[PDB]
Amino acid sequence: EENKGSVEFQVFCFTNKIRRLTLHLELHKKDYSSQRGLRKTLGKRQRLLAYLLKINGVRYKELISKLNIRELKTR
Amino acid sequence: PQCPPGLRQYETMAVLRPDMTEDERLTLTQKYEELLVAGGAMYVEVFNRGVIPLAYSIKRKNKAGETNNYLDGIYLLFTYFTKPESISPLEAALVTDDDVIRSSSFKIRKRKY
Amino acid sequence: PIQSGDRIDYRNMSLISRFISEQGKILSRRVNRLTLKQQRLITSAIKQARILSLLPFLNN
Amino acid sequence: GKDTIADIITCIRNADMNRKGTVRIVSTNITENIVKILLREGFIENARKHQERNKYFLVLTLRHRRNKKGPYLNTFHLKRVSRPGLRIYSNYQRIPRILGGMGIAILSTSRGIMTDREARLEGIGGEILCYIW
Amino acid sequence: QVKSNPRNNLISGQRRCGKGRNARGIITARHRGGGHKRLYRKIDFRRNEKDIYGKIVTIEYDPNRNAYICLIHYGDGEKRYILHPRGAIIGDTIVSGTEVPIKMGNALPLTDMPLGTAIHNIEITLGRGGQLARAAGAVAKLIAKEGKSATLKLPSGEVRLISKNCSATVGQVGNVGVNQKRLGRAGSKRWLGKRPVVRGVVMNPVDHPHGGGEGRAPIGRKSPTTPWGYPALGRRSRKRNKYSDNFIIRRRS
């Protein structure tokens, strides 16, 4: 189904699992074990976005405009 | 065969006081079956093994204020498939009744050794 | 030699009471010569049964 | 695997110290060349290539044990010089020679890889990959 | 939370006026006087109107007690005030009767309350109206019941018997953080009509049992004393034989 390994799909899967985890981080704030993971995964997504910005500018800007991902910290 | 579509498998054991008749027993049966089904339970399968002496004595207080000391007991066994969301009120509702002295519920995992 | 071919649960009391001592204590894995996985499941079982008064904590 | 060259060199050193004739190394232009040179110098018995799952392995036969495994007067030493952190280059007149020439020095230069001897004939300097005793 | 409505028929101006003056006009209860004019909200403490379904329209401020109060409607159109239970939100539904669900704001006799419940607004007398546990954050557990009598643990800690046929309401009384206020200044007390208090040691010997010694008085009195000559500390004033005594079991600690 499309490319399940593609940059844009992976970044989507990460963004979605993150917004899913935000709800559990809210209901129980005292779970740090979970948050440590959230930080890891958010780190991966950030990584791929940076890589993707290096490789192709158009696909990148399209993607972070599309999935509502915040603009990058290189500015 | 059992095949849940987006539900979890469950076993529940409940224990009732030995002084009960079969009509009060089937009244509770009916009540909890209806609770399960109202909570989105396909396949409510009920089974019963009654009046076995307990390992140890158990005390239950009633709403009438009675202290009931028991020896025997009535074991009801429930195999049902429910949303993981709705198992929550069931256990409290089981603890609530004066007829259920000891209740417990288990999730069932497939055995592979 | 000895083995479990039937599903172990808290409600097979023959099964569990094989693995319980005289005084109701749970026997160690070294004695019962079971795989680790087995002994764990046994133990959880014995406890759950213990709460349902199928098997006693202490004796009479 | 930050450095492939040093890795080849290292696997050789390890197989050698353990008194084993046979080594598997991963091939590459550099690897292959280096090994070729290693053969025309006479430091290594024989080389050959293998392929599986699109991986290339050069296996290297190594010079036999010295008149037993226990009483060894000689080992065979390898040393990385220019490495990713510090790249060492030399002109024609700084080109190193090992132990008065008994060993050799490997150079990567404009005309390809070679020994210091070839560099001296042709008059070229370059990047020094390793030393070999 | 707090929004002023127009005036419902429940809010009047009629009242005692001189605070702490009795018939003779003497000041009896000291320290009152001054402070903002207030209106009386007619609370429904009895909740005696049975078996109709009430609905919380709003939540309002009351000057008279530190709790909150709720305007509730009915289908009949009658409007009452009730004490605001803790955790209740506008749109909620409440009811009183005998056979009733047990939830926040419902009112029932003590015959029907499951033991261990947390109660407020408790009649000691049938139909007299609710009396015990009416303040902010006040609550009482129903511990046990036997014979014609039910047992409570009052917010003072005191355990006491009452009648099993006396109505009471589930849920603790709202506005729990009110004592977490810090008034911060003198004026803020005076707004409440609480006037300044003079320490005994300060006044002259005629005026009070710790009277002026020369510089500053330690109380030489062999005991700390009321303005009126009674031991101030740890002398129990409960009437010895008062009728209530059979009912009262353990005393507040």
Add this chain to the structure above:
RNA sequence: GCGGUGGAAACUACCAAGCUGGAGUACGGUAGGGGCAGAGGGAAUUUCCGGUGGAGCGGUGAAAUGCGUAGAGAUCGGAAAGAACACCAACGGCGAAAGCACUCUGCUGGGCCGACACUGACACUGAGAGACGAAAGCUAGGGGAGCGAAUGGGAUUAGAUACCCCAGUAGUCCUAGCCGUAAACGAUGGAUACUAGGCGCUGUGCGUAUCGACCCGUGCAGUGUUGUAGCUAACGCGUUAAGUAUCCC
């Protein structure tokens, strides 16, 4: 050494296209005291209310304080409360570390394994910065059985502000915060590659055994004990290096 110019194109660097073995994604499995939250359970102990009973209990190296005829301890029956979870438990499991174990359910973090299903270098480390971080301690509100700094009494002793005993306040618990330290230890930073074995265990996969439990041989992933090469000042470490090499702090 610096500057100009003519050549060379292996290595670093750049530019264009490729490739999976590195790193990930999907799929399908499976173990687990991983974390947070909500239910339930039993011993034992202490106190309180009774019945019996009627002189000592308790305690030490030996005693005494203490508790006891106002009926102690003992024993039976009742209530109530808090805290901790016997056996299982193991030279076992998971966790980044701290830590995590009566039972259950719910929300959720990773890990590993088998398949080409896919992307195609997306990697490794990390100055500053962030988050977590035993116990004690502190702020605010609860809670308080046992234990127990402080404190008091009894002894012991030249003395005893100690060890021992009798009492016992903070605290230990819960909620919301702060503190940010420990022999926070493997006294061993992280990643990768490569170098005899023997005996073990945990999770899985394959073949065999039977057609389901073993059983065997093996592939990985982690975990433990002896030990060759090599290393080391010695002790020792030794595929989970303190060996042989590369990179970062």
